[PDB]
């Protein structure tokens, strides 16, 4: 019996363990409060849903264990700051940018920049122009960066994984909407654009590498007009890959028990495409299950307005199936769901 | 004529054709790379200097070969892991130990292992503290082993032989110095401590029995506070026991003939105490000889840093003589030389 202990006590813990059971591996997805003798710690391998946590009697054990993967990691992408020079260390497309120094450079970065600037805290964010320079806070002065504001066609991420061995293993490009600065909808075809795909794969794998990261990793990027630039990326299972869970022959969740056992970690097999629709600050509706189509992912938690609830994941090798069925969605669900479906929807069109 | 071919074209072969030629057996060592036609494999007995070889023209007829002394005891003996559990399996004591096979493991090996684990391969070293986790290759996972690191009091070697009869004779035990991993003096005396060395006796027989060894073998242990550990085991004649030639009425490689050849096998007697000094990356300084209690043996390598190009023995029944020519060797031996001398001076004190 292989364990692990996952720290963070969200959905993404609540579906590694239920990921983890059918295999024979136990997860214990832990809380940072939690006291180290409630949790097998001591036998297990450690990850985390969480990029950084504060310190605690937890935690400061943790940060002694042996076999807490990627440990490493989390700070420098934690850090924005930090993060941006990654990808600039590998020579990777990004937004340009530079950390808030002093008022003195204001100046000219509107100049390389342009119109809107982009400010944001290095641990929300601020659309700055020029004028409304006074409109930020004193604090932000070097612990605040900017970046070029960026016109992209559209958002896709790359879900993959890396063994110990160094072997890769990546999903097709996922499509993902954002509403608010949430995600949305994402969906994902089988076959991504080749060319594309390849592009997006040779960016992760560098960063991956370079980080000796094992597990599974997500990397937000823009689709734009010089190519796709990498946005941001998250050292865990992501939101976006939720889809995998019934579209794909090894879900994420999976994946990345596997990598940190050291189980083997061949290619995923994905025949269709999927649709995966999120459920934000709404309550269940078990008519949605009147569609034989549809695969409910509800995650237990107190309904709240903002909060991410649970999930509906949809595949299917009819497309018209597949469209019909989120028509029928559409009055099933809040009308704030309703751009989100039409939009997943124009995909297939 | 008896004839025997030995396995491996070093010093111990050199110095076993030497002690046959006496005794009318013609010794044959040989290397890897000849060809089985240059060897009277055919009508001799085989033994060997080495205990794993690579398959070659040679090799591969002797693996066929009808009198190939302990042919399959090598293996065992090669692995660390078949080494350890034939301990295990005896109920010999010996350092706590067990193969690396997960990360997952690590916490609590450290926990009945300790501070210091001892990682080492199957077929150098390393020498990792919790953290240090990292530093190891991925590789070693299920190819490498743990021990825990253990103090000793001092290290001694046991020296000894077994008949075709289950006859069986030992040498008295013989006080070892390494540094940096290499043997550098050896120290015997004609009376051991009885009990320790009825100790390591039984533990060797019990060894020997169970392998259906015949021939010569050395153990090598640790003092300890809760007595003698099994470090590891040699299947045939071993440096430490060297200082046999000149010291006792049979030498070891002598006994290693007398026992394959089916030869008498009764127990040499030592009558006095006797001091071994290696000759580790040095030049022959003939000044030595100055001195009459000295015995060269020098193999005639190519000489090379860290490489044994040959020994001294030391023995006398005048304890005073006996370290009187050991001070008087300092000067004429490199400083590296010194520590070793006092140390062994410091037995006779």
Redesign the interface.
Known sequence: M??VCVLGNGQLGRMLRQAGEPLGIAVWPVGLDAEPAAVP?????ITAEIERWPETALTRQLA????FVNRDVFPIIADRLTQKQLFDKLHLPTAPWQLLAERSEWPAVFDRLGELAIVKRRTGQWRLRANETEQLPAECYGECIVEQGINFSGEVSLVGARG??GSTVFYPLTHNLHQDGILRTSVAFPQANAQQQARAEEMLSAIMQELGYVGVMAMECFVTPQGLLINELAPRVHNSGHWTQNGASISQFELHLRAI??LPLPQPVVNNPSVMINLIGSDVNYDWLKLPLVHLHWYDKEVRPGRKVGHLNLTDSDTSRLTATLEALIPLLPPEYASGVIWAQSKFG
């Open positions: 292989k364990q710690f001591q036998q297990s391998v002694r264990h042996p076999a110990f061995d056992t050291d």
